[PDB]
């Protein structure tokens, strides 16, 4: 099996990486944006089952909850679905401030890598995409926030997920997108 | 010399990587977009001649052809040029469905790295960019598509390219940008 | 402690990397954009003090100076500030032409990683963000330009910065965003 690192209490394989496309640096409260995010096997160990997790983090307030935004996603060429609030981690409060909401966005990918039994194996060099639609409710703002892509994997076939609500017992390399939720910049000239 | 990996029947050097800037997650049919893509030598072997290849992929249909889109590019500081359909690979059809069209975007870079003899060497840490204009014809859509960046390189001076229509006998690390070709998202609220 | 590579006359630790969010591939002269940029410790050596440097590069002209654009930034959840022209490197002129202007954008991050003594240590997996507002004066254009992210670190606490005007005596992995400064693309159809 592959080499894992310890981070908090979890096992991380940096060879499974994630990339964002189309995240804006400023998001307007109330408006819907669409971006894509995808994880790729940059190693040589083929995982038997995989799925994406998305983390939304506010650094400057701790009152954000799952119900403060609407979240839809589509795994590659499968159909759109609404992200399930039951498949989220409970709010986490880092000692450095803020709160983050981790949401599972897994499932079949339209039969590209996914198999009849529902698994999404991930051979080397291959990738899985989530097209993601996101909107925060009006009336909430943050001056330093982030979306994080947290790829999840099952190391061995038959393994169970280890964080309640999220996919995987091991995880890939965390990828970040920093943004502000608020008003865009006024003209400097 | 550098170490290569096998992928299909080709040689890949993961130290030559590519990055996209400004690709949108949703592209309107008929509309022209501009993005940039660039490849960087993150290794220590200086390549004698290099050029970018671009792949357009639809996962949910197989009728896309080179004639269905218009494509222009400029290599770093050189002038714009129309991409040559003769310098493309034939449509490729993955066993899981869909189609992709690989298009060569090579040429001198405006005298930054390029040499009088026409080659574009790539010393370590240096990079080459393509500014890219792209438009799909109206009446064609895809709900899960991608642009892939495929850096191509000549291992030795005087080598010949190995995929007909594309540049290079060895290749860098494939980079992806997933998007949809269709209508932007309606409001979630 | 970490291993460094030589580049020009400086020391580079490729484990400190940087990512861009929201840079457009075409910037309108006179218009203000906001993007984000952040550096992440992908290694295991915790640097005692860190800060971001940003380089603005035109490849096709050499008359650009710091006074030709306006530049503001905000380190994570700290406050907005105007970038200080005295904390810039002198204009640098590549032998092939063009000019680039390197600007320091360091400072505390709102007490996320920053400490009372003002330092910004960077433990493993952690990151620091700069939200950036940028505008070029109208009447200036470039057909191949770039923003470069240059993380600076102080290896060991007592070290002093090695490039006057910039933060750090060692540096992280340079990250690029290529763009044009001018008019957007006219329709190809
Ligand atoms: C309509 As025809 C796609 O086969 O160019
Ligand atoms: Cl050839
Ligand atoms: Cl930070
Ligand atoms: Mg370049």
Numbering used by the authors:
A (entry chain A), B (entry chain C), C (entry chain B): 9 to 197
What text does the study give?
In this work, we report the identification and characterization of a small enzyme AvmM that can catalyze the construction of a 16-membered macrocyclic ring in the biosynthesis of alchivemycin A. We show through in vivo gene deletion, in vitro biochemical assay and isotope labelling experiments that AvmM catalyzes tandem dehydration and Michael-type addition to generate the core scaffold of 1. Consistent with the apparent molecular weight (66.2 kDa) determined by the gel-filtration analysis, AvmM was characterized as a homotrimer, with each monomer adopting a jelly roll fold. The overall monomeric structure comprises of eight main β-strands arranged in two parallel four-stranded sheets, and three small β sheets. Using the DALI search program, AvmM shares low structural similarities to some components of large proteins, all of which adopted a jelly roll fold.
However, AvmM shows no sequence homology to proteins with known structures, and it contains only two Met residues, which prevented us from using SAD (single-wavelength anomalous diffraction) phasing methods to determine its structure. Consequently, the structure of AvmM was determined by SAD phasing using a Se-Met derivative crystal, and the resolution was extended to 2.09 Å resolution in a native crystal.
